[PDB]
Amino acid sequence: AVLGLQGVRGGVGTTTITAALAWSLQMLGENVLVVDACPDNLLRLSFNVDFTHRQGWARAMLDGQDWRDAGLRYTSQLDLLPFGQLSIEEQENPQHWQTRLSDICSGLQQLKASGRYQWILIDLPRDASQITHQLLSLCDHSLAIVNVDANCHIRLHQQALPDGAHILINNFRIGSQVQDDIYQLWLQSQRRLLPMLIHRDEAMAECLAAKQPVGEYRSDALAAEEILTLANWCLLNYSGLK
Amino acid sequence: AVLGLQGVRGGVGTTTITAALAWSLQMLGENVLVVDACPDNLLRLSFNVDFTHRQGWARAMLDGQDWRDAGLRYTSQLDLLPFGQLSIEEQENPQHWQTRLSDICSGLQQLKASGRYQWILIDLPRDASQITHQLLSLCDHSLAIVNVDANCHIRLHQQALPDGAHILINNFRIGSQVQDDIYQLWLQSQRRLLPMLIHRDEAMAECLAAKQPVGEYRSDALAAEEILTLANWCLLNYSG
Amino acid sequence: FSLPDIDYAEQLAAALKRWPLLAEFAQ
Amino acid sequence: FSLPDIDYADISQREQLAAALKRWPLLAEFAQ
Ligand SMILES: Nc1ncnc2c1ncn2[C@@H]1O[C@H](COP(=O)(O)OP(=O)(O)OP(=O)(O)O)[C@@H](O)[C@H]1O
Ligand SMILES: Nc1ncnc2c1ncn2[C@@H]1O[C@H](COP(=O)(O)OP(=O)(O)OP(=O)(O)O)[C@@H](O)[C@H]1O
Ligand SMILES: [Mg+2]
Ligand SMILES: [Mg+2]
Numbered sequence: 418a419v420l421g422l423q424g425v426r427g428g429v430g431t432t433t434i435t436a437a438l439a440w441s442l443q444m445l446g447e448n449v450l451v452v453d454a455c456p457d458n459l460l461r462l463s464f465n466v467d468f469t470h471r472q473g474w475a476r477a478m479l480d481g482q483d484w485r486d487a488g489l490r491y492t493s494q495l496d497l498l499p500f501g502q503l504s505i506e507e508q509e510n511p512q513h514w515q516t517r518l519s520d521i522c523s524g525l526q527q528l529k530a531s532g533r534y535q536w537i538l539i540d541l542p543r544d545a546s547q548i549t550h551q552l553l554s555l556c557d558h559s560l561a562i563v564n565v566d567a568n569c570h571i572r573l574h575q576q577a578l579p580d581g582a583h584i585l586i587n588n589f590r591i592g593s594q595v596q597d598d599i600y601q602l603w604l605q606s607q608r609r610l611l612p613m614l615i616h617r618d619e620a621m622a623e624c625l626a627a628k629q630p631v632g633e634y635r636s637d638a639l640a641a642e643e644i645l646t647l648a649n650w651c652l653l654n655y656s657g658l659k
Numbered sequence: 660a661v662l663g664l665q666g667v668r669g670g671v672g673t674t675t676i677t678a679a680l681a682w683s684l685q686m687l688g689e690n691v692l693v694v695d696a697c698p699d700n701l702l703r704l705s706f707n708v709d710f711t712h713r714q715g716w717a718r719a720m721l722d723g724q725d726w727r728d729a730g731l732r733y734t735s736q737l738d739l740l741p742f743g744q745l746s747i748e749e750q751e752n753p754q755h756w757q758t759r760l761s762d763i764c765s766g767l768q769q770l771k772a773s774g775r776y777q778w779i780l781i782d783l784p785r786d787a788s789q790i791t792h793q794l795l796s797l798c799d800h801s802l803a804i805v806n807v808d809a810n811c812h813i814r815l816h817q818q819a820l821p822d823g824a825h826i827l828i829n830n831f832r833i834g835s836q837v838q839d840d841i842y843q844l845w846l847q848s849q850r851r852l853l854p855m856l857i858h859r860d861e862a863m864a865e866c867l868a869a870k871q872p873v874g875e876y877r878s879d880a881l882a883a884e885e886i887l888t889l890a891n892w893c894l895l896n897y898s899g
Numbered sequence: 900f901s902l903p904d905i906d907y908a909e910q911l912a913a914a915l916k917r918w919p920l921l922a923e924f925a926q
Numbered sequence: 927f928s929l930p931d932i933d934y935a936d937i938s939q940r941e942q943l944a945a946a947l948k949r950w951p952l953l954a955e956f957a958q
Contacts, residue, residue: 426699427669427785428810457668459813468816468955505819509787509927543669544786545751561903567867567920568670571701574710574924577747577900584903595865598914602921605911608904623837625809626950710923751900792927803930809952816956819927826930840946844953847943850931868918 418655419529421556421579423541424563425572430587431562433621433631435540436463437641440630441648443495447535450488452498452525454552455542456508461499464491465628474521476501479514484524496534511546518548525555536651553579558655560611564588565596565603573607585647586614588621613650615643660897661771663798663821665783666805667814672829673804675863675873676886677782678705682872683883683890684778685736692730692776694767695742696794697784698750703741706733707870716763718743721756726766738776757788764793771797795821800897802853806830807838807845815849827889828856855892857885934958 422438424431432455439451453460458473466489474484479501489497507514529537539552553559559582563569578584584607591597603610615621620638624631632641664680666673674697681693695702700715708731716726721743731739749756771779781794795801801821805811807828815826826849832838845852857863862880866873874883907925915922934957937943947954 424669427666428671428806432810457814457818459810462813462952465951468813502817505927505929508818509792511787545753550751564670566864567918568674568701570868570921570924571704571710572699573903573905575744575902576699576750578903580901593861593864595861595868595918598918598921599868602911602914602925606905606907608906619835619837622808622835623950626812626837626841626952628951704920707919747900747902812952812956815930816932818929820930822928837950840950841953843940843942844937844946844957847937847940848932848934848957850933865918868920870919 418535418557418658419525419537419539419555420651420655421539421541421553421559423553423559423561423579424543425561425569425576425578427543429562429564429569430615430621432460432540433463433625434560434562434585434587434615434644435538436460437624437631437644438648438651439495439536439538440632441645442536442651443492444632445648445652446494447652448494448533449536449538450496450498450528450534452537452539453500454539454549456500456503456511457542458500458502460540461489461497462628463625463630464489464497466497466499470499471502473499473501475514475518476503478518478520479507484521515546515548519551521548522551522555525552529555557657557659559583560585561609562587565600567595567599570599578609582609583611584609585611588617589614590617611647611650613643613646615640615647660777660800660899661767661779661781661798662893662897663781663783663795663801665795665801665803665821665824666785667803667811667818667820669785671804671806671811672857672863674701674782675705675867676804676827676829676857677780678702679863679866679873679883679886680890680893681737681778681780682874683887684893685734686874686887687890687894689777689894690736691778691780692738692740692770694740694779694781696781696791698742698745698753699784700742700744702782703739704870705867705872706731706739708739708741712741713744715741715743717756717760718745720760720762721749726763753788757790760790761793763790764797767794768797799899800825802827804829807842809837809841812841824851826852828852830859831856832859853889853892855885855888857882857889
């Protein structure tokens with residue numbers, strides 16, 4: 418199945434959760450492809466890709482090359498497709514390229530039909546570009562990543578989520594009166610909430626600095642155990658295709 | 660002085676800091692206009708604006724109306740210009756309106772030249788739209804908001820910041836060796852880092868739920884004092 | 900793309916009275 | 927728009943930074 422992950426806003430933990438969930442599914446025996454659809458091109462760094470390695474599916478397209486040559490194998494059952502490094506000129510001029518990347522959709526749709534992977538996870542940016550909407554349309558299921566704070570609370574009342582998305586809380590830690598108030602409120606009111614969450618955990622802060630997914634970095638961390646529970650939930654509930 | 664504030668990624672605290680810095684500048688005797696340049700239109704909620712109040716400078720501009728009629732008075736020293744509420748369809752089709760907003764730049768240039776306000780603070784989104792670029796061009800100074808984590812660390816090596824921007828840490832907390840390591844590294848290497856920061860602080864989490872700037876909500880909060888230190892530094896260094 | 904499915908129909912009343920932002924969305 | 931001014935010249939001079947660079951491959955990578 419194709420699974421999109423997209424933060425309700427920036428910085429909520431989408432990329433770290435994508436890399437960790439990919440690692441967990443791979444550990445459960447699944448063949449997994451992870452695709453970074455964010456121009457930040459950060460996902461690769463949870464998989465020990467050198468910062469100076471500029472290649473990626475989008476970089477290859479913009480350079481008139483084959484996006485299939487940009488894949489990297491992390492384990493025998495986990496492959497990675499980085500976005501590629503954009504120059505500063507490209508970063509600040511998205512109108513020069515965000516319409517020229519639509520070939521990735523038929524490429525991924527073919528890859529999906531081949532069945533070489535049980536899971537294709539897509540780290541999606543929090544933008545409304547054409548390529549984000551098109552990649553979202555290829556997803557069988559989707560996770561909308563939040564943190565328990567007033568900003569996310571507002572966003573849930575005013576912005577669209579992908580249809581059929583479930584909501585996954587990250588970075589949670591009890592003790593804050595206002596965050597606990599919001600949390601209890603969501604429990605009684607947010608119908609799309611998943612039955613598990615990811616706690617704040619220094620393993621989730623450290624694993625990126627160690628350039629590893631959280632489950633490889635510290636397998637007995639609470640957040641790694643929670644990501645594993647999410648992986649099992651995906652296998653049970655997100656296995657069907659659109 | 661026109662001061663732009665822009666997170667190096669989403670969620671770092673840009674909007675809460677913008678509302679708090681405006682309040683502090685007011686407490687120091689200054690006249691301030693705060694402009695929300697983010698389509699999320701969240702800044703207004705720190706100033707007790709009803710969620711269902713949809714007006715704002717962009718909402719007016721798209722509706723064919725005078726954007727200058729969408730400003731709101733918060734105190735005698737502090738005015739607010741919300742972005743306005745976009746419909747779901749507008750939010751998912753930024754190409755339908757991102758070029759229809761370019762009059763705000765000339766409008767804010769007129770306001771700047773009038774000297775009506777001593778400070779104009781602009782809450783800027785982290786997109787690469789031409790309007791974000793042009794609003795940044797009329798800022799005399801800018802703050803790039805970060806949190807001390809591996810994500811912002813990577814970003815500072817690969818993405819452009821507004822020219823001349825200084826870097827402001829928010830959400831500094833206890834309990835993270837990796838944060839402390841990155842922080843000590845920044846102290847020796849990040850040339851544009853500001854000499855003060857803002858901690859994670861329950862008052863910065865609560866003030867948005869109370870719909871107030873942090874310094875109005877809890878004037879003796881540690882984070883309100885940290886923002887006041889920031890406001891004093893801006894007075895001394897960003898006045899030109 | 901649609902708005903999240905939110906249903907507002909014991910200690911929630913305390914949180915709603917504590918925080919004007921939360922009271923606003925709840926009614 | 928420019929990339930942030932970052933100077934790693936005076937890094938390898940304090941033992942507190944050297945231990946962090948040894949701990950964290952991401953930080954060593956940018957510094958060297
Ligand atoms: N549960 C967690 N506990 C502690 N730190 C976390 C947790 N989740 C994420 N982090 C840290 O938060 C920072 C941002 O995480 P991440 O890059 O995954 O978020 P994001 O939503 O993808 O960000 P972006 O907006 O850049 O795409 C990283 O430094 C990461 O290590
Ligand atoms: N120092 C802090 N301590 C505690 N909570 C904080 C702090 N700074 C901000 N917050 C909380 O973090 C959330 C996000 O903050 P804010 O909206 O200011 O960030 P932002 O960078 O503007 O976000 P966005 O990407 O939506 O524009 C809010 O709920 C706010 O109350
Ligand atoms: Mg990310
Ligand atoms: Mg904001």
